[PDB]
Amino acid sequence: EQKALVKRITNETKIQIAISLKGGPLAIEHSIFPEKAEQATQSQVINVHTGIGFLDHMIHALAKHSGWSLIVECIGDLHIDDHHTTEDCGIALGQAFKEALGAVRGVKRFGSGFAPLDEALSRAVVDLSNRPYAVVELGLQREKVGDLSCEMIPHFLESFAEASRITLHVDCLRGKNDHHRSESAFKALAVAIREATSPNGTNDVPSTKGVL
Amino acid sequence: EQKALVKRITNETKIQIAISLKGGPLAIEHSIFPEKAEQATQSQVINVHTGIGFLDHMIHALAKHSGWSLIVECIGDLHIDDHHTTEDCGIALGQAFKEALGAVRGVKRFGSGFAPLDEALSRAVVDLSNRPYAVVELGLQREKVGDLSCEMIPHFLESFAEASRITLHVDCLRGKNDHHRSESAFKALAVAIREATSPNGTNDVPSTKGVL
Amino acid sequence: EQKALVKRITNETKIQIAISLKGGPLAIEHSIFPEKAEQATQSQVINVHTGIGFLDHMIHALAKHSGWSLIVECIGDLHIDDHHTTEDCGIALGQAFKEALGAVRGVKRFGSGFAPLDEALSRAVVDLSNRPYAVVELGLQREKVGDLSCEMIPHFLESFAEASRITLHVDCLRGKNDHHRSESAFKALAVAIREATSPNGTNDVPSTKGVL
Amino acid sequence: EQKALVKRITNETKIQIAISLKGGPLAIEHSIFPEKAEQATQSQVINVHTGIGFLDHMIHALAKHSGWSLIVECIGDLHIDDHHTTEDCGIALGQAFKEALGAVRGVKRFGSGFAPLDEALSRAVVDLSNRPYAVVELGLQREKVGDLSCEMIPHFLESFAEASRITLHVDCLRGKNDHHRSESAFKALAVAIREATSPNGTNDVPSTKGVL
Amino acid sequence: EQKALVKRITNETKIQIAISLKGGPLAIEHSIFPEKAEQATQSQVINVHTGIGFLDHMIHALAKHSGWSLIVECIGDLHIDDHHTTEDCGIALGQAFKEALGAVRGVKRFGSGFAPLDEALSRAVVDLSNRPYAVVELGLQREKVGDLSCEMIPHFLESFAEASRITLHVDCLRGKNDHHRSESAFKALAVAIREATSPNGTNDVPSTKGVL
Amino acid sequence: EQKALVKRITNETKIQIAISLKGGPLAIEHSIFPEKAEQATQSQVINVHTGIGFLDHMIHALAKHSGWSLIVECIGDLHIDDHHTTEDCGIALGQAFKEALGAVRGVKRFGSGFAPLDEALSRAVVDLSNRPYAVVELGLQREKVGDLSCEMIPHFLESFAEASRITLHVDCLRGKNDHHRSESAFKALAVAIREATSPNGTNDVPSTKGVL
Ligand SMILES: O=P(O)(O)C[C@H](O)Cn1cncn1
Ligand SMILES: O=P(O)(O)C[C@H](O)Cn1cncn1
Ligand SMILES: O=P(O)(O)C[C@H](O)Cn1cncn1
Ligand SMILES: O=P(O)(O)C[C@H](O)Cn1cncn1
Ligand SMILES: O=P(O)(O)C[C@H](O)Cn1cncn1
Ligand SMILES: O=P(O)(O)C[C@H](O)Cn1cncn1
Ligand SMILES: [Mn+2]
Ligand SMILES: [Mn+2]
Ligand SMILES: [Mn+2]
Ligand SMILES: [Mn+2]
Ligand SMILES: [Mn+2]
Ligand SMILES: [Mn+2]
Ligand SMILES: [Mn+2]
Ligand SMILES: [Mn+2]
Ligand SMILES: [Mn+2]
Ligand SMILES: [Mn+2]
Ligand SMILES: [Mn+2]
Ligand SMILES: [Mn+2]
Structure with a gap:
């Protein structure tokens, strides 16, 4: 489907x-x-x-x-x-x-996902509304992880929300290992997309302006 | 019903x-x-x-x-x-x-809802316990939006939780547009009430003191 | 045409x-x-x-x-x-x-426009590259101008660059009248779009990746 | 079962x-x-x-x-x-x-639970991954509640996550009554464990490394 | 044996x-x-x-x-x-x-080890008690040493104390070379494990609660 | 030619x-x-x-x-x-x-070029006067980009203006991605050299001292 x-x-x-x-x-x-x-x-x-x-x-x-x-x-x-x-x-x-x-x-239409990974804690909310937006505040105090340049990890989620036409707020709340801090962000986004794309039922476009 | x-x-x-x-x-x-x-x-x-x-x-x-x-x-x-x-x-x-x-x-009995609107991010938790309480921390740096006087937006949610006998924490986490910041609060409360009033099943009043 | x-x-x-x-x-x-x-x-x-x-x-x-x-x-x-x-x-x-x-x-493909209006000074650069972006830093210390709500003036240019697929940096450098400060931003954007959409000649897509 | x-x-x-x-x-x-x-x-x-x-x-x-x-x-x-x-x-x-x-x-595998109790607000996330971890940041400005010594309330949740092999982040966001602040933490953990131990369906161990 | x-x-x-x-x-x-x-x-x-x-x-x-x-x-x-x-x-x-x-x-049951390496100084204490704990405070101002990513050096000792069921405090007291600072930590842990696993004599489990 | x-x-x-x-x-x-x-x-x-x-x-x-x-x-x-x-x-x-x-x-003789690249903004002015000078203020908070050592990016433009006998001011105004911040500097210099080497007309050496 x-x-x-x-x-x-x-x-x-x-x-x-x-x-x-x-x-x-x-x-x-x-x-x-x-x-x-x-x-x-x-x-x-x-x-x-x-x-x-x-x-x-x-x-x-x-x-x-x-x-x-x-x-x-x-x-x-x-x-x-x-x-x-x-x-x-x-x-x-x-x-x-x-x-x-x-x-x-x-x-x-509204998924929120918290996900920890071993003292790191990231939340991600997602909106599925056709204006793209991305507020990615992973505070990474590293320059490269293994091959990623560690400033592309927010830039990936920036262009993901840009081309998918979703509004996205990913924010790492704590953590001091940046493998942990960046993987928990992608695990939190996985919870939020799963929650926003979900069978609400009743077959109605969930918006005031009626257009999504 | x-x-x-x-x-x-x-x-x-x-x-x-x-x-x-x-x-x-x-x-x-x-x-x-x-x-x-x-x-x-x-x-x-x-x-x-x-x-x-x-x-x-x-x-x-x-x-x-x-x-x-x-x-x-x-x-x-x-x-x-x-x-x-x-x-x-x-x-x-x-x-x-x-x-x-x-x-x-x-x-x-416990609904939590995050909802974004285009760089604004608000969470709302709700409790459905018969003592009313309202902690509304929308940080709005505007005096009037279109006709609302922009200090009544917390005062609306104050009296809503007061007369509905629910405990409510609405807090806007970020945002710099106050139409966005106040609408995301009402969209976050809509997720939380939907989650708290939900078919838990098993037909039991969810409290230690047995009275809700 | x-x-x-x-x-x-x-x-x-x-x-x-x-x-x-x-x-x-x-x-x-x-x-x-x-x-x-x-x-x-x-x-x-x-x-x-x-x-x-x-x-x-x-x-x-x-x-x-x-x-x-x-x-x-x-x-x-x-x-x-x-x-x-x-x-x-x-x-x-x-x-x-x-x-x-x-x-x-x-x-x-690259227009830059400065425009003054009576102690206000705004620059606007524009990029015409198919990723949308908008960095609008009009520092407006007013809540409403005549009918605009004065936070929509950056939000207009945000959605303009969003739906037109251009990258846009509009920044008011000085000024203490917000009619002057916001009109000089739109007059600066008019210089930049005029300069970016211009007959370069030689009929070539001006990009490294060859796709615009 | x-x-x-x-x-x-x-x-x-x-x-x-x-x-x-x-x-x-x-x-x-x-x-x-x-x-x-x-x-x-x-x-x-x-x-x-x-x-x-x-x-x-x-x-x-x-x-x-x-x-x-x-x-x-x-x-x-x-x-x-x-x-x-x-x-x-x-x-x-x-x-x-x-x-x-x-x-x-x-x-x-990922439960997040917010729970209020009368101006106190606690979130708890839980991970169900076989490395134990506990980040418990209940800010309690009391020495004893009724018989608990009020530093054992984080130490209980420390040893709970330790011996249950789960990763746990419990953090009280606000509150100034420490019965309220500590009970909302245990009510938030109850929402998170209920959400993590849930029938996902499809019968698959939810991990990259395949071992949970 | x-x-x-x-x-x-x-x-x-x-x-x-x-x-x-x-x-x-x-x-x-x-x-x-x-x-x-x-x-x-x-x-x-x-x-x-x-x-x-x-x-x-x-x-x-x-x-x-x-x-x-x-x-x-x-x-x-x-x-x-x-x-x-x-x-x-x-x-x-x-x-x-x-x-x-x-x-x-x-x-x-109690080993303490100091070990220097050429202006770096690290102590390590170890406890051999069946609750795992790890307080690793190597202050490393480097991102990678040769292939280790220099935040895994505390994360190695974290998981070592975790899976070995020992309590461990490793703290580098001084030093400004991070090969020196991290090797002195592993040389200090080697002194502490050697001192804790030692023939005390008299054949008695060294605990108040009698269980180790 | x-x-x-x-x-x-x-x-x-x-x-x-x-x-x-x-x-x-x-x-x-x-x-x-x-x-x-x-x-x-x-x-x-x-x-x-x-x-x-x-x-x-x-x-x-x-x-x-x-x-x-x-x-x-x-x-x-x-x-x-x-x-x-x-x-x-x-x-x-x-x-x-x-x-x-x-x-x-x-x-x-005077080219000025602004060029953005996706929240980065760099201007470059160029002078074409036979004394070489280079004021390159790319504020790069990275040590290596992919193979360039990220302090050579100003040192390249230093030696370019040195051996070409031009005066050059390149300054990145904003940006927090250093691929974006350094590429916008070279795209801004491309606008300035194109503008300074341009057919002014009238066939006159544009200087007070008459020597260029
Ligand atoms: O988000 P929608 O489309 O459901 C209705 C909104 O009110 C539209 N909007 C866009 N900015 C502020 N509001
Ligand atoms: O919230 P309940 O009614 O489920 C039981 C609470 O312990 C009652 N309470 C009210 N303040 C503190 N506790
Ligand atoms: O801007 P372009 O498309 O001309 C080539 C760029 O290098 C592509 N890019 C996108 N981010 C950084 N670079
Ligand atoms: O958490 P998992 O087991 O699903 C896979 C992780 O990548 C393993 N890990 C442990 N620390 C960082 N990653
Ligand atoms: O450490 P033990 O087992 O020798 C006896 C301790 O008193 C047990 N304990 C654990 N926390 C505080 N005390
Ligand atoms: O720049 P020129 O050569 O056009 C004339 C200048 O006045 C020469 N100069 C060099 N330093 C200050 N002035
Ligand atoms: Mn790990
Ligand atoms: Mn991993
Ligand atoms: Mn009133
Ligand atoms: Mn809007
Ligand atoms: Mn609206
Ligand atoms: Mn006017
Ligand atoms: Mn203890
Ligand atoms: Mn109670
Ligand atoms: Mn060595
Ligand atoms: Mn050199
Ligand atoms: Mn890019
Ligand atoms: Mn590039």
Whole structure:
């Protein structure tokens, strides 16, 4: 039902993102890697292959705790820094989430998610209203985690909310380990998207202005 | 099932509030306006007519995201300021919510709701315990929004929790637009009341002292 | 050549914006006002009719110093405050500017405009790159100007850059009259859009990634 | 289904804790008190008998709003202070919660609970991941409540998360009555455990590393 | 006598740790590296092979000054950062130390160790009491040492005390070289474990509550 | 017309820079790489090959928005840090710009360029007067971007203005992403050089002292 595939091709990166919000299986009929963080345990299949290993782990923890099936492919330039291949892999990952739920009606529209990870604590609220907005206040006192440049972790969530047309407030409340502090943000966003995209029932677009 | 009508008549305002917490249709057999923010889309009907237009919009966003059907009619004095017609239209709107749920049993009793609106972020918790309390910390750096006097927006929620016999903590966490900051508070309260008045199941009054 | 008409219809406002970036004449074949800030001096015709008079004057000064022909018709709710009829009349005014220039190629792409107005000084830079962004730092120490609520003046430029897919930095450098301070911002944006949408020549999309 | 009994016997205290997470009835076939806060209203039976009366009331409010059936029997030394009989009655109460849910799979894994009590406001998040952690920031400006020594209230929740192998962040946001401030923390933890131990469905261990 | 082998297998790392607290020789009958910091000088054999070279050097200096024989084999994911292969190689290294001394009786139970390294000075106290605790206050003003991410150095000792069920206070008193500051912490812990696990004599469990 | 080739050969780096300020095609008759950021779209050809990938991207964005055709070949020592191959490389790129415009007459002589990039804002002014000067105030709170050492980004523009005999003030006004903050500086310099080297007309050396 809620499936989409997005092939975003620019002169910096080549993207192919297939998503399924309700879970289940996924494949790719024609991949972009030559010769055709991976969890495939019979309910959801999530297999992310970007050039950045720590940014694979954040999309993986996002889709594991959202109930998503998600295949991410990215052939990006890594002789240059990791900005152009994290910003572009967040724009196309917001578009795949946007096309997978067309009609915003019959949903809760408001998800809030707290998630801890071992003294770090992050909340994420999400709004699903067609104006994009992103208030990402991860206070990270590190310059690079393993390959992510640690200022792209807010910039990923900035472009995710931008291209998915959602309003997003992610704020890490405490923590002093920045693997812990950044993974808890993606685990908190996974709780909020799961709560906002939910069967409200009664089949009504949840807005005053009637347009979502 | 959960319906109530409250006709509050004083020498300052005349009120008639009909509410339905489970949604559905509503009408008035004998209105107070002469010759007999309006959403009527087949699941819930919410039609608020106070003399204040911005206070219409806050009760509307409250009832739209609560699943309520709600008709509000307030004939109040507006040659004087808007205090006497916002305080009185919040006392009677807490009484209509109170009479619509008589027995507080089989409910979650604890609703917490975060709701953003475009860089503003408000949380609201609600308690449904028969002592009234209201801790409303909307930090509004404006004097009037469109017709509300912007200090009545906490005073509305003060008298709502007062006359509905609930404990309420509404706190705007961030934001620098006070339409955004005050509407997100009413959208957050709508999530919390929806979560506290919920089918817990097992038919038990959720209290240590056994009285709610 | 560079003309567009946008009819944005929601349950709060009804909009009809016809724009011509190269100037010249404009009309409307079927208007939204019943029975069919106005400058019509033989080179460009600019006629803005919103319910807010001071927001008419800011779109007028924007289109007068941009070389635009622009007709704006907004039927919005004014018994509620002026947010819903200024935000919506900025989203549709960014969409009309976006559809009027389809191919961003052969343009300067970078406009910077300083404009004074009688001790106020505002600069505006504009980027014409398909990610929207808005950094609007008008320091206004007023609550309402004549009918605008003076926090909507940054919120107008926020939604203009949002729906037009441009990056925008507007910053008032000095000034202590907020009519002067806000009009100089719209006069500075008019210089920047005029400078960014300009005949660069040589017919090339001005980007590293080749996509604009 | 989710039942466990823990008999923890040391030279300071003797403990016997029988728990049922899904509610229902409970008894003890051979008690530790001589000759064989009590709620027994036909859905859940919660009967706590420690030597500390205020620590009875906090385990009672924890199990009342969690849906638990819980019998606590602690024979501890009270001629010495109340540390050794509150720390030990929290270690065994985390072990009884741990043995009552063996397989952490098919659960939400992330519960967040806000709960007010009459100007006090506490949130509690819980993680159900097999590393124990406890960040308890109840700001209590009292030395003893009725018999608890008011620094054991964080030390109880420290040893509860320690022996139950969960990660826990309990933080009182406001309040100036420390009965209110400490009871709202246990009422907030009751919402979070109820939300984390919940039927997620689809029968999958919710972790990246696959081990919970 | 005091030997243990721990094979910890998760979907992130595969661990095999063989320890001997009294020294002597050690081998592995079936290793995890393909085709079958190393000191093997006739009294103790210590051979650590993790993917991190600086974390090899800290376990090596820990076991060299403890009298241990210790073989560490960790096959961990290093395309992601080094957190998951340092946290997991500290949990299994606390479990191997825990299983190597079963009965905590006849031991000093309290080891304190100061160790300098060239203007750095660290103390470490250790408690061997079955509640785990870790207060690690290495003040490191570096982000990465050679491959360790320099916030994992406290996180290693956190999970070591966690899984070994010991209470641990490691605090660097001075120093301005963070190789020196972190190696002196592991050399100080080696003095403390050597002092706590020591032949007290008289064969008695050293506790008031009689249970260790 | 405005073409130059500079082959700078030292014992640290070997450079070959061919430039064309008016655009058009460029080739190299005898390259320095064995066996003979690249944009070649029919108007200008820009192909930079230094050992640093992020410094390729900054010369590329400089020449893309200047109208330049530019081939850069730098064979530099990278077992040592990147200073000697970014400085050396900046000196020869100022000399190639200097030899490409011999007679400074008939030009505007004063270019100012603002350029944003996604909350970063940089201005650059340029003077084309034969005393070199460089006031570069990029406030970068990072140590390395991808391969550039992030203090060489001002040191590149220092040596560019030094060897090109121009006066240069580059100042980033805001921004909190240092890829954004440093790329906007090179995009702002591209606007300023384009504006200073411009057909003023009337064929006069624009100076009081008559010598440029
Ligand atoms: O958020 P909505 O669309 O449900 C109705 C809002 O009132 C529209 N809005 C946009 N800014 C402030 N309000
Ligand atoms: O809130 P309840 O009624 O469930 C039981 C409370 O303990 C009563 N109370 C009122 N103030 C402090 N406690
Ligand atoms: O701005 P562009 O598209 O010309 C190339 C940029 O490098 C892309 N980008 C986006 N963020 C940082 N860089
Ligand atoms: O929390 P998990 O087990 O779901 C996967 C985590 O990434 C493991 N971890 C432990 N510290 C940081 N991460
Ligand atoms: O540490 P022990 O077990 O020797 C006896 C302690 O008194 C127990 N305890 C735990 N917290 C405070 N005391
Ligand atoms: O800048 P010029 O050469 O046009 C004339 C200047 O006055 C020369 N100068 C150099 N320092 C101060 N003035
Ligand atoms: Mn970017
Ligand atoms: Mn992780
Ligand atoms: Mn009042
Ligand atoms: Mn509104
Ligand atoms: Mn708005
Ligand atoms: Mn004016
Ligand atoms: Mn204790
Ligand atoms: Mn109480
Ligand atoms: Mn960890
Ligand atoms: Mn060393
Ligand atoms: Mn130098
Ligand atoms: Mn870039």
